[PDB]
# Entry
Amino acid sequence: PSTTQARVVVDELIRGGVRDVVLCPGSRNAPLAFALQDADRSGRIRLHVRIDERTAGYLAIGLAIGAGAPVCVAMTSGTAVANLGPAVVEANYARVPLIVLSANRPYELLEQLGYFGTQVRASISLGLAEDAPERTSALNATWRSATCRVLAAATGARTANAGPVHFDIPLRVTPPGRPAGKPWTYTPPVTFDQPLDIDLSVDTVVISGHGAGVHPNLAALPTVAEPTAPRSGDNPLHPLALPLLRPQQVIMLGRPTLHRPVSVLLADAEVPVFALTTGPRWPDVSGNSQATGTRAVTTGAPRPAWLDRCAAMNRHAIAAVREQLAAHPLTTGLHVAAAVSHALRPGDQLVLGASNPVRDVALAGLDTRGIRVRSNRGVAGIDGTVSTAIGAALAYEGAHERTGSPDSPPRTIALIGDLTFVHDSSGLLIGPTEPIPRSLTIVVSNDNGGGSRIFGTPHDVDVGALCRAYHVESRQIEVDELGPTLDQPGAGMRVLEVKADRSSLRQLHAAIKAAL
Amino acid sequence: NPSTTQARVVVDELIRGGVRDVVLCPGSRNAPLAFALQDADRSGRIRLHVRIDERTAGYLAIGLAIGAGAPVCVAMTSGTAVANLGPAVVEANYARVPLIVLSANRPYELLGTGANQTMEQLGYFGTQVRASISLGLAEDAPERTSALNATWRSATCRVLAAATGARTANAGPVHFDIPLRVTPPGRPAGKPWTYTPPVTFDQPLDIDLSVDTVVISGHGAGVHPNLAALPTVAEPTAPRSGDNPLHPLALPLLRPQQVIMLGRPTLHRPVSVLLADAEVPVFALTTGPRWPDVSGNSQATGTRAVTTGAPRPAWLDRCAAMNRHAIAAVREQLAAHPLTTGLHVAAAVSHALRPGDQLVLGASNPVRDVALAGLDTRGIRVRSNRGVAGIDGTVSTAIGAALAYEGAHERTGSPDSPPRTIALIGDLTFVHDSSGLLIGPTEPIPRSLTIVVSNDNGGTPHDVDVGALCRAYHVESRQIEVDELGPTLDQPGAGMRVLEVKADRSSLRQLHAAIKAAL
Amino acid sequence: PSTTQARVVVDELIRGGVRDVVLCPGSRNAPLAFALQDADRSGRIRLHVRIDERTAGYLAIGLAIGAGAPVCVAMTSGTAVANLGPAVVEANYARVPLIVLSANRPYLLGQLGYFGTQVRASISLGLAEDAPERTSALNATWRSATCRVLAAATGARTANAGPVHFDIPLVTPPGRPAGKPWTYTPPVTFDQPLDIDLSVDTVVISGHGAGVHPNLAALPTVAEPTAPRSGDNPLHPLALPLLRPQQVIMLGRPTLHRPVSVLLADAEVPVFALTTGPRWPDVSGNSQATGTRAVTTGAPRPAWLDRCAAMNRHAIAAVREQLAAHPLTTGLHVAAAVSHALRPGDQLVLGASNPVRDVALAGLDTRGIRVRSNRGVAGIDGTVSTAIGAALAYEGAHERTGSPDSPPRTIALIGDLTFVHDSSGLLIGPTEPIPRSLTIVVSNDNGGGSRIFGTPHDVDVGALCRAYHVESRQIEVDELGPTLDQPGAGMRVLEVKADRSSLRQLHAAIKAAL
Ligand SMILES: O=C(O)c1cc(O)c2ccccc2c1O
Ligand SMILES: O=C(O)c1cc(O)c2ccccc2c1O
Ligand SMILES: O=C(O)c1cc(O)c2ccccc2c1O
# Structure
C-alpha cells in the first residue's frame, strides 16, 4: 500500500538524476524513509542523516550545487518546515534544485508558514495509496508521471529556472519503469533563447554576477566577474578599477550583487545596461536595465584604446592592492583571502561565506578559471555555509569516484568568517555511519566580527575547542602556513583557524583607496 | 501632484507596451488613473471601455485580449471591486490571457485600521496571478522626479513582460496594485523602458510518423506543419495544421499505436478514456512550460517534433473512412430527429460560417455541440473561455472579442465591412451574463456582433423573456426558427443584436443515444 | 459510506442553529447534497438554490443578518471560490456568520489567496474511513469538528463572527439527547471597561456593529442607520461642524459622513473606541483607548446638552426646508419619503452608496425598525439578494413566533447602479423560497455621487423586472407612501426616477441654510 508507492517514487527519483538524499530523524515520514534506506543499502543513492533540520537544508543545497543535481530533504517533524525555511529561500533565489519531501496525514481533522507559497516552484501532492491491485499498473504511471513533474520543476527542465519544490505523499515486486532506467516522462532540457543587438565597439564593460552564463563572443571585452560567476574570456578587470573609468555601455551577466561602484554604474541613468540571464528573471538597479536577453549578437569589436585603458588600470588596481597589503603590519581577512587565492590550483572547489570572504577574494583578484566557486549568494546569508561546503565536497568527490580516475579526489576549500562558522558550527557534527567528505578543508578567518557594541559583536569563542568537541581535526595557523598546510593532506575534513584583526582593517582600505 | 504624475507615467508605458484597450470601473480611489486613462483615450492612444459591473468588466477584457492578442488592462478601486475579478483572473490563468488587473487602493498604512473599503488586496488572487507587483505610494519628492520615473516605468514593463509571457512563454493575469492618497518622458521613439525581444522556448523530440498516429489538438495548441497530414481530433478553439480531420466520435472506433497531444485537450470523455490506455504512448507538445496530466502514460513532452517517416496510406484511409462514418451518423440522426435541439442550432451556426469570421462559444454546451457537428475551423477564429469553462462572462467576452477583432481590422486600413463576430451560447449562460450587454452610450459598441442564444430549460428550471432582457439593455433582439438562422446571419443588421432560437432539451438523450447507436 | 458522515454533519448544523443553506449546481456533485435534500424535505432546514454563485453568497449574507443565525453555502465548481470572494470579504468585515462548504477528493493535487486572509478558520474533516467498529468515536470527532466550524463562524469563543471554510472530503449516528449540540459552547461575554468622564463635553458616534450602552443614553449621539440606538437624544450628522466636543465616544465601526472622520481624526479630541469585538478602528491613529463598555463619572453639562439639541433641531429644519423648496426630485427626496413611510417592526435594507447616507440625512428614526446594509466593504453588489435573504430569514423567524398578524414588510432602498449590478438575483425559481413582504425601492438617476465619474446607462428597470417576472411600478415620490402601505406581491419593486444635475444645487442650499 503506502510502502509500495514509497519504493516506486524513489526508483523514479534515482532515474530522474537524484543521487543524494538528506534526512532528519523524526516521528513522521517512516515508509518513504525505509524505501530510501533500501536504495541506500543497495547503493543507488547515498543517504545523509543530521539532527539539526536547518543545517540539513544547507547540506542538501551543498550536494545540489556540488554536482548540479537534484537533492531531496525528508521532513519528519513539525519543526522541519520552519527550519528548512532558510535553505528553501536560498534555493529559490539561487535557483538550486531542492525537492522537499513531506507526508501529510489525510485521515485526520484539518504547522506550516506562508513561505512555501512565495518560494517554491511547485507544491505537488501525490494521491493516497489505493487498494486497487488491478489498477496498480495504472496507478504506477501517475506516480512516475507525477515524480517526473517535481523533478522537471526542481531542475527547471521546461522553465529554465531551477528552484525548490514541495513534494507531498499522503499517509494513512515494485512496478517497473521504462527500459534502460529511463524516466517515465522524458522531457529534454529546454533551450531558452532570446537574442539582443549590441554594438561591441562602444566602450563596454561586462559585469557578470551570480548565475551568469558564458558567452564566447564576449570573451574579449573587459569584464568584472564576481567569484561565483564563470569566466568567458581572459581579459579580467578588477572591481576597484571601475570608478577610474567612465564606460558608455554595460553588459550584465546574471545577478550581480557586489561592490559599491557596480551598484552606482548600473544605476547611472546616462549609462545604458543590457542584462543577459540564463533564466526568466532579470535584475535591475534603480530601474536602469535597458534590455533583457539570453545572448547578444555582436557588431564590431571595441576600440583598443578603451581596451588598453582598462587593462592598464586593471594592473594599477591589482598592484595597488598587492602592494598595500604587503605594507600592512597585521594579518586581516583580506590577507587571509589573498593567501587562499594564491594557494589554489585548477580542479579545486572553492566555497565562500556570503559576507566579507566573497568580497575579499574579489579584492585579492583571484583567477577562477579552472576553479569551481560556490557561494550562497541568492539571499546572502551567513547561515549554513559549513554544511554547504560539506555537501559540495561530497557531491564533487562523488563525481570523481564515479569518474573512475585513480586520482586523489579534488580538494574542496572553504573560506568563512567566524560569525559564519559559529552560526553553522553544528554542521560539523556527523555520525560515524554518515558520509563524510574526503578532501575538505575549511579556512576560518576569525576577526571577532564581520562587515561599537552592536555593529561588531565580540564572542571570544574558542574555535579549536569547539572543533575538538565535535571530533574534527583543527589547527590554529598563521597566514604563511596556509598555502603550505593546504597542500599537505591531513584528515578528510579539517578546520584551519587564522586569527585576524578588524581595527587595522579600516585603515587598510583607506590606504588601498589612497594608492588608487 | 504625485498621484497624477504616477498615473500618467504608468499609463504611458502600458501604451508603449502594446496596450490598445483598457476596461475601467469608476469609483472614489479610482480618480488619478481614470483621468490618466481618459487623456490617453481622448488623444486616441487607447480605446477605453467603462463598465459598471467589475466581474463582467474583467471578462470584457479577456475578450479584448483574445480577439487580437494584445495585453488588456483593467482598472478598478479597492474593496469588493477587485474581488469581483476573481473569476476573470482564474480564467486568464488557465487560458494564458495577458490580463493586467490594475487596482487602486487606499494606502497600505490604512490596512487593519478599519478604514472603509479597504481589505487584504495585494495577494488576493494568490497563486492564480502570474505576479503581484505593487507600485510604491507616490511620495512628494520632486528632487527625485527623474529617479522615480525610471523605477515606475521599469516596474510597468515587468508587469507587461509577466502578463504577456515575454520571457517565460506563459502569459496570464498580473495583479498591479497602486496605492494613492509635463509628464516625465519615457524612452525615445516610443520604445518600452526595458525592452524585451521575442523569446523562444524550444524542446524538439524524435517522433516516428510511420507508426499509426492520431493527433489530439486541445486549447492553446500550436501549429506544426510536420503533422498537417496526420489524422487530428482537433477541438474548436484549436488551430488546425492540416486538412485531414477526424471526428471525436470516430476515435473510440479506431486503434491507434501512437498519439500526439497538442495543447491542453479538455473536451470529450473518449479522449480522456483513450489517454488512460497505457499501451498507446502519448507525446505532449505544448507552447509553454505547462503540460497536461490528462494522460498518465505521457512518454515525453516538448515544444516541437522532428519526424521520421510518414503514416501508411492504409492508416490514412482507415481514419478518413471512420471520420466520414461519424459525420454521417451525426448528419443522419440530426436530420431524422423530428424536433430541434441545441445540437440542431449548433449545426446551423457552423454552416453559416464563412472564412474571416470570429466564432465565440459558450464554454459548456456549445463547444461540445459545435465539435460534434464537425465544424471546419480553417480560416475561422474560434474563441472560448476554456481555461476554467465557467458560465460567467460569456456575453462580455464575445463583446470584447468583437471589439478587438473589429478594431484590428480597422488598423489594417482595408476599406470594406468589418468582419462578423457571431457567438453561440445557451440561455442559462446568457441570462447569467446579461449584465454584459449594458454598454454606455459613449462607450465602444461592436460593429458586427450577433449573439445566437439557444434557449431551452436549463442547458433546475427557469422561464425568462429573453426579449425583455435585451429590451432592458436596449439591444435589438428577434426570435427566429432554426432554418431561418443562416439567412438572417447572412444579412447584416445592427451593430449588436441577439437571435433567440427556441430549442428542446427533452429529446437530447433520445438524439444522443441514436448517434451512438448509429456508429 | 461517506453519506453517513454527511448525514451527521448536517444534523450538527441544524443542532448548532443553521436554518438556511444556499446551494448552486456545478461541475462536481455538491458536498453532502443528499443529506441536505432530506433535511430540506423533512423541514429541519430551508434550502435555496441559485444559478449565480456571486448572488448566492450575498443571498446567504442576507439570510444570516436577517435574523442572526449562521448560514451555509455549498459550492461545487472551479469558479465557485472566486465568485464567493466579494461575499466572503463582506462577511469578514461585517462579522457575519457565513459557513462555506467544500468537498475535495484526496485520492492527485498540484483557490485564491483571500481564503487565508478572510476566513476565521479553515477546518477539513477527516476522510470517512470504512470501518464500522470505530464509528462510535468517529461520530464524536465528526460532531466535534462541526461545532468548531459553528463556534468559529458565530464567534462563540472569540466574540468575532465571520466566514469559515468547512471541507468534507469525498439509521444515522445519534447526537446528544434533547437535540443539543455535541460540544456545547455558550456565547462568551467579552468584557473590557474604560473610565470615561461624562462631565467633559462628549459626543457619541455609533457605526456599523455598535453595541447598546444604557449609561450612554443621555449623551447626544450621531448614529448611523445600521447602528442600534441606545437613547432618545439624537444629533444630526450635519450639526457636527457647528459644535466643539471635548470628547468623542466611538461605538462600533463608523464609516459614513465626512464630518465624523474629520472629528475622529482630530488630534486635539480624545477618542474612546467602544466595540463589541476584539477589533477596533482608528482614524489617523487618534483612538486614545479601547473597551467594550464605559464606567461613567458625572453627567453631561446641561449647556452642552442644550446646544447640541439646539444645533440638531436647526440641522433637522435646514434639510426639511431645502428638500421642500427644491423643485426636482432627488435621491434625498426618495430617501426622505421611504423614511417617513416606515413603521416600527419593519426591516430596512440600504444600498451601500448614497441611500445609506441619504436616509441618515433625512433624520430617520431607527427605533423599532431593523436596519441592514453591507457596510463591511461597502460594496455595490449583492444588495437585492441581501434584501431577499434578509426578508426570508426575517419572515421565517416571525413565522416561528406563530403570531397571526401579517408578516412584517421588508423594504429596501437602493440606487440604480446597485440594482443593475445585482439584477440577476431577482430570478428565483418556483421551486425556491420567495419573500412574502419584500418591497424594493429603486432610486434611479444614472449614477450617484463626467464620462468616468458618472456612468449613464439608460436602462428600462420596468422591462428588466418584466424579464424576471417581478411585479414593478414606476411611481412618484408623492405616491410612494401610499403604495408602500398597500401590500402587493411577495417580491415587488417600485422605481422612482431622480435627477443628479440638481443635487449640487440642493446640497449647497442646505450648506447655505446651516
Ligand atoms: O539570473 C539569475 O540567476 C537570477 C536569479 C534570481 O534569484 C533573481 C531574483 C530576482 C531578480 C532577478 C534574478 C536573476 O536574474
Ligand atoms: O499549454 C497550455 O496551453 C496549457 C495551459 C494551462 O493553463 C494548463 C494548465 C494545467 C495543465 C496543463 C496546461 C497546459 O498544457
Ligand atoms: O466592530 C465591528 O463591526 C468591526 C468590524 C471590522 O471589520 C473591523 C475591522 C478593523 C477594525 C475594526 C473593526 C470593527 O470594529
Notes: Residues B 114; C 93, 95, 208-209, 252-253, 275, 277, 279-281, 376 surround 1,4-dihydroxy-2-naphthoic acid (ligand 3) (CB under 6 Å).
